[PDB]
Amino acid sequence: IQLTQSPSSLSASVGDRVTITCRASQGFSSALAWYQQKPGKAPKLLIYDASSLESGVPSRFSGSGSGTDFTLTISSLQPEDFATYYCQQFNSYPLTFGGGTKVEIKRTVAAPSVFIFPPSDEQLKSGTASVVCLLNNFYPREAKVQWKVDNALQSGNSQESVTEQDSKDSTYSLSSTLTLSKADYEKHKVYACEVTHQGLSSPVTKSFNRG
Amino acid sequence: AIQLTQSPSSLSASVGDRVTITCRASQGFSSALAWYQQKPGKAPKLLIYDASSLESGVPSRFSGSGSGTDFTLTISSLQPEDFATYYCQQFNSYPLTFGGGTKVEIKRTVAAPSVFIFPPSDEQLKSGTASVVCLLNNFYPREAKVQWKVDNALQSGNSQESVTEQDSKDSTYSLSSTLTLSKADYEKHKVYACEVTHQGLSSPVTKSFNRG
Amino acid sequence: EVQLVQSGAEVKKPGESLKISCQSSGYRFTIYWIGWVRQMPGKGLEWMGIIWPGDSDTRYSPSFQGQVTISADKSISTAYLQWSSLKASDTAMYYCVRGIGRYSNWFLDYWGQGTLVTVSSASTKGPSVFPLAPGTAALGCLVKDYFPEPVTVSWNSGALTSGVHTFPAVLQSSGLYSLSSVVTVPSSSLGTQTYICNVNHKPSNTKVDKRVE
Amino acid sequence: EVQLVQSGAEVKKPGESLKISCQSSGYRFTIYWIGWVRQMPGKGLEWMGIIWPGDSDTRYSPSFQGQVTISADKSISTAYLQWSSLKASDTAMYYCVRGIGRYSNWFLDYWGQGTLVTVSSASTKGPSVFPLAPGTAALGCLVKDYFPEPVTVSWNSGALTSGVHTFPAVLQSSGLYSLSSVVTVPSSSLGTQTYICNVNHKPSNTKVDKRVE
Amino acid sequence: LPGEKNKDGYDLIATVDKLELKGTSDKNNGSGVLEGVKADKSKVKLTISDDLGQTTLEVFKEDGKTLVSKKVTSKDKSSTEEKFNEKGEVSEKIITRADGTRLEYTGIKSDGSGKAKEVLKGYVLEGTLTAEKTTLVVKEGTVTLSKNISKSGEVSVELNDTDSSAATKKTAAWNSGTSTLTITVNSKKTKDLVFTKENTITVQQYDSNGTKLEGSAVEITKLDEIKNAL
Amino acid sequence: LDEKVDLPGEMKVLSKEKNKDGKYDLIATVDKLELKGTSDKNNGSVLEGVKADKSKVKLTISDDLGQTTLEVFKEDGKTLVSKKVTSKDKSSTEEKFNEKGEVSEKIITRADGTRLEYTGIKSDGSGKAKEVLKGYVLEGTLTAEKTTLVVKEGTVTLSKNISKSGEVSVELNDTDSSAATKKTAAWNSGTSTLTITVNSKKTKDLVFTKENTITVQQYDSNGTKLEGSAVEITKLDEIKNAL
Ligand SMILES: [Cl-]
């Protein structure tokens, strides 16, 4: 039994009422379950028999459906409800799951805090440098980071990693790591990190000096 | 898996013609096909292997060719003995798969049937039952009407019919109608008749005999 | 020369085991593949598996894996097809085949005469043979009230070939199959030549021989 | 109080067997189904099999029958997921799950924390922890040049929770993973409070603890 | 109902088996779940359909996830009660039809096998159950009548006699359209055994020469009337 | 018959005027065995012929004169012995078949001469594979999934994986412990180069060329930039010396 689970991406604000759909290749009645996979953790059972709430999950979660289309519902969306939600069939052997449904929380614009970290001296004894620029607790996910070393722009020598939604304030956080060898670090003086984001009236710059 | 679709399904032709069967493959390969022939009553015989190689023991008038998706089995000068169902088979992706078949029919000239009638055996009469059998022998085409007149009175349903396939030599058909009724209904009446209508008949001829 | 003789036809009931054999003669038994091909009535050819003696490298079809077992006893040139419990859905015809191997696969060059497995919980009844007594004349033998198929019919121990017509068995209203065999001979032989029909209903192991007028 | 504790993460190479365990607790172990559920990276949740302790009633999914072995020792309240000749195609996350019985099937009410099995013929490199040294302040630990996943970073032995952000690891050009864990603390503490980060690379059996300015 | 706004809005309550069960619903007809705790600490959940034509009473295992006995009653008196083992599979399955003809399944094994019986008016048949179909077997001597009821609902009836005398051996054919079982002995029809749609069986004999029928159909009332016909 | 066009696999085929009662006739000598046959077009496209050992020989020439298919059979005409499929770019592919119908040997000769010798193929798809390069010979094993070639130097084991789709993937594994002397390696499908890293410092680049060669290129003492030129390896003890 194929299990088409739609939509895939989904954004909504706190207090809204969202509805996920699980479409089964074959029809049945009350033989589907819902799970909530929060990031980093394991799936948690939300709904069993497609209409029965398990004691231990909040009252706002509900689910219904019959035939070939099923539906999970949240009466009042909360920032902790950020997860991926799966639908599982136990009608016909073997068990199956839906493709998944990410649920994103819409939030007011949060301006990021920008921190800059110089490379450790212990790493310089390994012959390479790693400069990190930290963007913390912003919204939305889109943000640009430029790496200026001694007023000179740098491309291709950086890597950026972002977190998932925070389960409390629904913000993101980003880490752009600049990797260059010890030889090029000892030469230039000023290392900067230019940050552009919706919550910034003007690009915020953060710097330090070699040594 | 690989589906294999044959075409056509049924096929008529006359002696001396040149028929071609095709094997349409769900996937593409080369020289990994076989051709079989299942005459009525018998088992499939290997005609061609590797999609082009004829096996000794089958006449030279059989040939096969093709590559990629479409393969073809071809008969040079069709003969009545070639009446059979033909299958193709791939051996590129296992499991093996066959085609649904392709029946091959021989168009003959029209032939009027020879008709016979038979009385129930005296050993059958010791069983409380009697069977009267009407025979249509070596006719063409297959469509034919058989009506049972029992002592000039018609009868419906209480008969069963069976037709042969085309004989491998002359390509004719044969039919048998069996009149089944209990011994009580048989001793009562005098005459049992069989009325035949066929495309080869200028007028319906009748065969009969009398009780005892 | 190369011959493949199979077990006779059989009758089973849903739940019964079954083992049918194929006896090989005419070739070096342990250097060619041997397999089993199904042919459902109405449907076409379905492959089950294949085995190579005496490596005993048994190789099945996914549609039959775990549902059947294929073996070979290379001391008797005999291959086997074997079930554990039969379902009525397995009522078909089964051919043992010798196969030439191409890369990891095979085409089947020789075919056995087939074994008609019939799986039904019905009465197994042998046939009852009655004569069909008469420049040409037609005679025959009525093979009535038998189950299950198939029945082989021959004439004069197989010496009578031309003119023979054996009809496809028509199932009666009593659940028992019935067919007629008919032969065509000249009239000047009727009083100077006896004609014997030979009936073999292997499922019930019945053998009859009849006469004429 | 129902808990499921699973085996630690494992690295293997194509050709090795592997056993992973899961230790149930909190309920009557010999009355509830236990099974294994796979989550291929990027792909969705795939189901492998299930077992009922204790009579060892084992049921597998066709997509995994013959590829895996599921067992359960009721004397120790522990289920096992067992392989032989691992493939690189087996690299995924495996959850031991407790099953509640429906008609010949189950849904999964409890899940283990997951066991990540990485299968590659690549060098297993241990991480290298460097500090990120600095009215709020931020500090962290740069965890560089390790393989394979996963890795765990905690702060002051799990005493620091609020304001901790561990970024998803990113794969570099050298073929080694690298991530950064970051905590945000008030500046009125920096001089009066030390911060230790704790890294556990169970794949390469690496445990480190760093400090800051 | 079948099977014998406020505050924050409706509110509904049901008392079953001397145990009060209460719940909350939305519409103003009675469609809603009825949770309820037992004294033995079990969990009982009662459901009423939207069109008020099907109840669904279920019993749960204290944690309410594992089942004990789900009974699904409908508007036409058709109840389908099931009881469950310690591992989630169906132990018993009783299908009380609209007309009262129960259909009992007992002691089901783990491979889909059990001891089945169809309860008609006056007599109680027996048989077994395999995954393919239900088989109801009525034997008398050497003739064993078999009633095949598939899992899809199709009713087919086969007959088998182990006799050897072709004068006394008994065959039978089937017409799924007429739903009649035509019995034949010595190439002579003896009787019809029609399985009416309304869970009853009718015998009607042919004449002594097997041409047509005689008398009228006989609704069987005792089990020995079936064996009498065999 | 027959004397009053070049063909692959160093073979030669010959009749202008149409044969009687059919389609063009042609003759070809292969391994001192005269093969004759009949085709349709006048280009030179099968050639049957019997062996002195009573085996059967069949030569199939393509319709565009770019590929031959030499097959040898087991005197029944149906059981295979040896099928050699040569092409127009010297790209021959010989195969030998065991007594049950599977493939025991498979020698894949490329257009440049670098062969790919497979020997002793078991029933489940395992074999002793080896690649014959220009000057040196790599060895390894064969799996149903892929062909893996291995080069060992102490603790470092270099694996060359040839996926059955044809993709060449390369991985290095080192059993060394100390991160100062431990050797890790990365692989780029695009450049087809394996970059080795030791003590968090790049040491050398290993390019697996498209014309079946392996060129080494060293990094500087600071791991920053490439140095010198790419030295093509010509002996096996040069790949080991890099590891
Ligand atoms: Cl012999």
Side-chain angles (χ1 to χ4, degrees), chain E residues 89-109:
Chain E
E89 305 177 298
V90 46
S91 166
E92 298 178 19
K93 193 175 178 185
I94 308 181
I95 307 183
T96 299
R97 291 192 187 93
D99 52 6
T101 65
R102 290 192 275 94
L103 182 44
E104 299 200 3
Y105 293 84
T106 78
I108 300 190
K109 251 63 187 64

Tab-separated table of all heavy atoms in Angstrom, chain E residues 89-109:
chain	number	residue	atom	x	y	z
E	89	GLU	N	-4.050	-10.502	17.980
E	89	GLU	CA	-4.811	-11.171	16.935
E	89	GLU	C	-6.171	-11.619	17.461
E	89	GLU	O	-6.392	-11.743	18.669
E	89	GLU	CB	-4.032	-12.362	16.376
E	89	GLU	CG	-2.642	-12.003	15.873
E	89	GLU	CD	-1.863	-13.208	15.382
E	89	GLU	OE1	-1.605	-14.124	16.191
E	89	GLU	OE2	-1.508	-13.237	14.186
E	90	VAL	N	-7.087	-11.864	16.529
E	90	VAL	CA	-8.470	-12.179	16.870
E	90	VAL	C	-8.553	-13.621	17.360
E	90	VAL	O	-8.133	-14.553	16.666
E	90	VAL	CB	-9.402	-11.936	15.672
E	90	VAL	CG1	-8.819	-12.535	14.397
E	90	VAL	CG2	-10.784	-12.500	15.947
E	91	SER	N	-9.081	-13.803	18.571
E	91	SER	CA	-9.262	-15.127	19.156
E	91	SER	C	-10.604	-15.737	18.768
E	91	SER	O	-10.664	-16.894	18.339
E	91	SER	CB	-9.136	-15.049	20.681
E	91	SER	OG	-9.624	-16.229	21.297
E	92	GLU	N	-11.686	-14.976	18.914
E	92	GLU	CA	-13.020	-15.419	18.539
E	92	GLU	C	-13.680	-14.360	17.669
E	92	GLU	O	-13.369	-13.171	17.769
E	92	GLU	CB	-13.893	-15.699	19.770
E	92	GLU	CG	-13.371	-16.809	20.667
E	92	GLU	CD	-14.238	-17.020	21.892
E	92	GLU	OE1	-15.406	-16.575	21.881
E	92	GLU	OE2	-13.752	-17.633	22.868
E	93	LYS	N	-14.601	-14.803	16.816
E	93	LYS	CA	-15.294	-13.898	15.904
E	93	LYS	C	-16.697	-14.444	15.677
E	93	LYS	O	-16.864	-15.464	15.002
E	93	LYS	CB	-14.532	-13.757	14.589
E	93	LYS	CG	-15.003	-12.613	13.705
E	93	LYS	CD	-14.121	-12.478	12.473
E	93	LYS	CE	-14.605	-11.368	11.556
E	93	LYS	NZ	-13.809	-11.308	10.299
E	94	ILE	N	-17.696	-13.767	16.236
E	94	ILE	CA	-19.094	-14.167	16.123
E	94	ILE	C	-19.809	-13.131	15.269
E	94	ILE	O	-19.840	-11.943	15.617
E	94	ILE	CB	-19.759	-14.304	17.501
E	94	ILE	CG1	-18.920	-15.201	18.414
E	94	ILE	CG2	-21.169	-14.853	17.360
E	94	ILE	CD1	-19.519	-15.409	19.792
E	95	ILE	N	-20.381	-13.575	14.152
E	95	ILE	CA	-21.077	-12.675	13.240
E	95	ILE	C	-22.572	-12.962	13.298
E	95	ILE	O	-23.079	-13.829	12.577
E	95	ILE	CB	-20.538	-12.807	11.804
E	95	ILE	CG1	-19.019	-12.625	11.785
E	95	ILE	CG2	-21.201	-11.791	10.884
E	95	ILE	CD1	-18.414	-12.659	10.396
E	96	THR	N	-23.283	-12.240	14.161
E	96	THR	CA	-24.738	-12.334	14.228
E	96	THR	C	-25.318	-11.500	13.094
E	96	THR	O	-25.181	-10.272	13.084
E	96	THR	CB	-25.250	-11.854	15.583
E	96	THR	OG1	-24.715	-12.686	16.621
E	96	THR	CG2	-26.771	-11.914	15.633
E	97	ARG	N	-25.959	-12.160	12.135
E	97	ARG	CA	-26.502	-11.475	10.970
E	97	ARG	C	-27.777	-10.726	11.358
E	97	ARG	O	-28.151	-10.631	12.531
E	97	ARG	CB	-26.760	-12.462	9.837
E	97	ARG	CG	-25.512	-13.045	9.196
E	97	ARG	CD	-25.863	-13.767	7.904
E	97	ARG	NE	-24.721	-14.476	7.335
E	97	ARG	CZ	-24.446	-15.754	7.571
E	97	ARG	NH1	-25.237	-16.468	8.362
E	97	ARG	NH2	-23.386	-16.322	7.013
E	98	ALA	N	-28.458	-10.178	10.351
E	98	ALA	CA	-29.703	-9.460	10.599
E	98	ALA	C	-30.817	-10.410	11.017
E	98	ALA	O	-31.652	-10.064	11.861
E	98	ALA	CB	-30.109	-8.676	9.352
E	99	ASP	N	-30.841	-11.613	10.445
E	99	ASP	CA	-31.891	-12.593	10.689
E	99	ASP	C	-31.660	-13.431	11.940
E	99	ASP	O	-32.499	-14.280	12.260
E	99	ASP	CB	-32.040	-13.513	9.470
E	99	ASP	CG	-30.719	-14.122	9.028
E	99	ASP	OD1	-29.701	-13.935	9.728
E	99	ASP	OD2	-30.699	-14.797	7.975
E	100	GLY	N	-30.554	-13.221	12.651
E	100	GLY	CA	-30.246	-13.978	13.844
E	100	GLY	C	-29.337	-15.169	13.624
E	100	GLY	O	-28.932	-15.808	14.603
E	101	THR	N	-29.008	-15.483	12.374
E	101	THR	CA	-28.144	-16.619	12.064
E	101	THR	C	-26.713	-16.276	12.451
E	101	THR	O	-26.013	-15.561	11.731
E	101	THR	CB	-28.246	-16.977	10.586
E	101	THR	OG1	-27.740	-15.897	9.790
E	101	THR	CG2	-29.694	-17.249	10.209
E	102	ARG	N	-26.273	-16.782	13.599
E	102	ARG	CA	-24.909	-16.540	14.038
E	102	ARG	C	-23.929	-17.396	13.239
E	102	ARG	O	-24.299	-18.380	12.593
E	102	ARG	CB	-24.764	-16.822	15.535
E	102	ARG	CG	-25.469	-15.807	16.422
E	102	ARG	CD	-25.074	-15.949	17.888
E	102	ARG	NE	-25.863	-16.964	18.582
E	102	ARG	CZ	-25.490	-18.231	18.738
E	102	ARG	NH1	-24.326	-18.646	18.261
E	102	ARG	NH2	-26.279	-19.082	19.382
E	103	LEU	N	-22.657	-17.005	13.295
E	103	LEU	CA	-21.582	-17.675	12.556
E	103	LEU	C	-20.354	-17.637	13.466
E	103	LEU	O	-19.603	-16.659	13.473
E	103	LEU	CB	-21.333	-16.992	11.217
E	103	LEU	CG	-20.281	-17.552	10.255
E	103	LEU	CD1	-20.365	-19.065	10.159
E	103	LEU	CD2	-20.432	-16.919	8.879
E	104	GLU	N	-20.160	-18.710	14.232
E	104	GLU	CA	-19.181	-18.730	15.308
E	104	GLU	C	-17.818	-19.199	14.813
E	104	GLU	O	-17.714	-20.173	14.063
E	104	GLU	CB	-19.656	-19.642	16.443
E	104	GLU	CG	-20.969	-19.218	17.083
E	104	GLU	CD	-21.167	-19.818	18.462
E	104	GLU	OE1	-20.255	-20.524	18.941
E	104	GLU	OE2	-22.232	-19.578	19.070
E	105	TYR	N	-16.775	-18.490	15.240
E	105	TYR	CA	-15.388	-18.897	15.041
E	105	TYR	C	-14.737	-19.009	16.412
E	105	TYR	O	-14.741	-18.044	17.183
E	105	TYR	CB	-14.632	-17.896	14.164
E	105	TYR	CG	-15.097	-17.839	12.723
E	105	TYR	CD1	-16.179	-17.051	12.351
E	105	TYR	CD2	-14.451	-18.570	11.736
E	105	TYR	CE1	-16.606	-16.995	11.035
E	105	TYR	CE2	-14.870	-18.521	10.418
E	105	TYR	CZ	-15.947	-17.731	10.074
E	105	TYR	OH	-16.365	-17.682	8.764
E	106	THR	N	-14.182	-20.183	16.718
E	106	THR	CA	-13.633	-20.458	18.038
E	106	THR	C	-12.184	-20.916	17.930
E	106	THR	O	-11.770	-21.492	16.920
E	106	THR	CB	-14.445	-21.535	18.779
E	106	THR	OG1	-14.108	-22.829	18.265
E	106	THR	CG2	-15.938	-21.303	18.606
E	107	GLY	N	-11.422	-20.650	18.995
E	107	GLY	CA	-10.065	-21.141	19.153
E	107	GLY	C	-9.162	-20.965	17.949
E	107	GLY	O	-8.526	-21.923	17.500
E	108	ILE	N	-9.094	-19.743	17.422
E	108	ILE	CA	-8.330	-19.487	16.208
E	108	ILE	C	-6.841	-19.612	16.499
E	108	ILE	O	-6.326	-19.030	17.463
E	108	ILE	CB	-8.670	-18.100	15.643
E	108	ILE	CG1	-10.162	-18.010	15.312
E	108	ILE	CG2	-7.832	-17.806	14.407
E	108	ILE	CD1	-10.544	-16.767	14.537
E	109	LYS	N	-6.139	-20.373	15.661
E	109	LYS	CA	-4.696	-20.504	15.769
E	109	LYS	C	-4.003	-19.308	15.117
E	109	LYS	O	-4.636	-18.442	14.507
E	109	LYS	CB	-4.230	-21.813	15.132
E	109	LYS	CG	-3.761	-22.865	16.124
E	109	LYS	CD	-4.885	-23.311	17.045
E	109	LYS	CE	-4.362	-24.225	18.143
E	109	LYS	NZ	-3.412	-23.521	19.048
